[PDB]
Amino acid sequence: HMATLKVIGVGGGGNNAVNRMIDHGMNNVEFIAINTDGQALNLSKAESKIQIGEKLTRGLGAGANPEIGKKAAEESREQIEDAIQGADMVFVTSGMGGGTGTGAAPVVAKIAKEMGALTVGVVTRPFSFEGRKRQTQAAAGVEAMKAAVDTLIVIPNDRLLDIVDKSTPMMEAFKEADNVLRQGVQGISDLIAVSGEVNLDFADVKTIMSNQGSALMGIGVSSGENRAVEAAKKAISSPLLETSIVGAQGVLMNITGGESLSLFEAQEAADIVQDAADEDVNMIFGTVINPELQDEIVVTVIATGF
Template sequence: MLDFELDMQELTNIKVIGCGGGGGNAVNRMIIEGLRNVEFIVVNTDKQALLLSQANTKIQIGEKLTKGLGAGANPEIGKKAAEESREEIAEAIKGANMVFITAGMGGGTGTGAAPVVAEIAKSMNILTVGVVTKPFPFEGKRRMRHAEMGLENLKQHVDTLVIIPNEKLLAMADKKTTLLDSFKLADGVLRQGVQAISDLITIPGVVNADFADIETVMKDKGLAHMGVGYGKGDNKAQDAVRQAISSPLLETSIDGATGVIINFTGGVDLGAIEVYEAAEIVREAADIDANIIFGAVIDETLNDEIRLTVIATGFEEDNGKVTTSAPEAKIEPKPVAETIKKEEEPIKATHNDPLLDLDRESVNIPSFLRSRK
């Protein structure tokens, strides 16, 4: 007889890998924010940066090549450093079902090493997702050329790729916004995306999915849209979903997507009708035959509030092009301070909510709102 009293984390292992300085900083901020049910790894050529990392697993790549002094903004050095340390990287990610690779493209280590890390992960049959940033225009054409080169290399080795142009951070900022606060917004896209997938798989919720569902939507799908939204009040679900599908931090929307993951996190007052109406907005924007994976988790600390994550893949456009956000879907971005405040609140899903005890056999749930038995 099978023992079903298994820790779900034993069944599904998710790891976040920060490459270079930008990726390492993103990992640190996710750890501070309390991202749960994932393992953190940082890889860098800079020994000093590794000493400042809060990740449990730290890999100094290219020790012979760089002597721990960094890649000098040279992506070729970053690539060779990662290749020198292939065995250590493979050992660190062994056992993972899914990895998220994050880096700031345009420098040396992140740009050069991230594609190598992705190639190693894919060769181990691990679902591999890249979430990376592009440089600000003021950082110069040379750095932007390096970033574009790194992105092309990375696309060849990831299942899905989310790109956040740093320039988009300015759309959420005002004169009082600090640079650190701006980067928190970009990191929030990755953090909430990772958390949404982790919650869907590992946290008992009103509606859950399994890893096979996630893999169906994200494996070998190219460029992706990963948007997050927040809503409060009577129209909270619809407000949140509109933010998520037209994120001001991204250059993509979900128009024509053939695969969509949508995850709601709300309080005990989360209404069935408002969730249905919000999910309909996603369904209408996506392809008519889109595979929509839906999840809902109860967080008792939320009062008349909702957090929502939408991940969309499989766009119709050829050559990896995706549509930009449709004007009619756009909303006015909230002040950066308010957005950061909401993103910094830890997500505390509960296991004892009365909604979890519903007899689902007596509830007629549409197929795309199904729960994994």
């Protein structure tokens, strides 16, 4: 039996991320759009849509009030439960600092976690230009999210200002933030579908991610001379995430390479991840030999327990 994967967008930012993943097309993944705002939800491409808090907001947004988001989700608990039914893994994605995301996303997470699903949060923190109130609501939102999920990935939107030039379109910057969740979902789909030479399965994902807190995640791609060290360095250097690898107690790591993937290379990449941790780790290590690949290597890393 294959693990059932569901991705849930909660509020404006959450649903923007989901709409872009639906645009790409993820085949074995179920998408769920959750919002207070009915106009926005009507335009979603998601095949499962839940309008929350109709009695409370009359089909409008939460107007940046997290109490309205939270009570909206509590009003609609049974419809959330129904949409999540059957999930083995749930990704909850949302922008913190607004009303719907901040308030409803932790309610959604708690529902997913009590249904037995491995519950991963992927959230943003507001830009400093949005101001102190917005940042404060977001901090409370992150804390509520941390209590409700198995593992949380936090992307401060301020980090987008470190990866743009003065002309990079705003939408193109948002796509980079979006890639964290998209490549994460794809990585798990791959892990579940493909039998590895050193095989990792969904029980290995649960061991590393179940009942943790903050997580670092990344992917590194390289080829040529120093490909193993370069790939591993890129996977653990995640400029968009709040959490760094230092102090990690649990690591899931996979290397995908062609027939030339050397044992020496595998140790080099794994030593980069071990060393950067700076701890006595529980590493679960996997490898895939894809005979389609020539000189390209792909290292993927999830690091938890700080």
